[PDB]
Amino acid sequence: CGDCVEKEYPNRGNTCLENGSFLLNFTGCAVCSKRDFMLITNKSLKEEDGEEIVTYDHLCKNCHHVIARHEYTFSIMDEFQEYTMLCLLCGKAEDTISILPDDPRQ
Numbered sequence: 528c529g530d531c532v533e534k535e536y537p538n539r540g541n542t543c544l545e546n547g548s549f550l551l552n553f554t555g556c557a558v559c560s561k562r563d564f565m566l567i568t569n570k571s572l573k574e575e576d577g578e579e580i581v582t583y584d585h586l587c588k589n590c591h592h593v594i595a596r597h598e599y600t601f602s603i604m605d606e607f608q609e610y611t612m613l614c615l616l617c618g619k620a621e622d623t624i625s626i627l628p629d630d631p632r633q
């Protein structure tokens with residue numbers, strides 16, 4: 528309900544994830560008032576030309592209302608990798624890593 532989160536799309540100093548629920552930003556629901564109560568459902572995955580995308584939602588373990596929506600997208604460009612995340616709860620973040628054909632991933 529947006530009142531579920533302390534901050535809307537908090538920055539994570541570059542952290543981009545396809546899993547979990549950010550309990551440190553979740554202040555507990557406002558449809559029912561419960562905390563440390565959540566599930567994940569409708570989890571989709573997409574892949575275009577080397578880019579990998581993961582989209583999902585968070586649901587209150589008590590009232591099963593949709594707490595928030597999550598998106599994580601990952602792209603490979605020429606010699607580098609790009610990571611981006613956007614979630615009302617988990618946060619908004621972006622990172623880029625330079626790599627080699629030896630696949631070292633820093």
Ligand SMILES: [Zn+2]
Nearest residue numbers: 528556557558
């Ligand atoms: Zn809520």
Ligand SMILES: [Zn+2]
Nearest residue numbers: 556559587590
């Ligand atoms: Zn709730």
Ligand SMILES: [Zn+2]
Nearest residue numbers: 597614616617
């Ligand atoms: Zn999230």
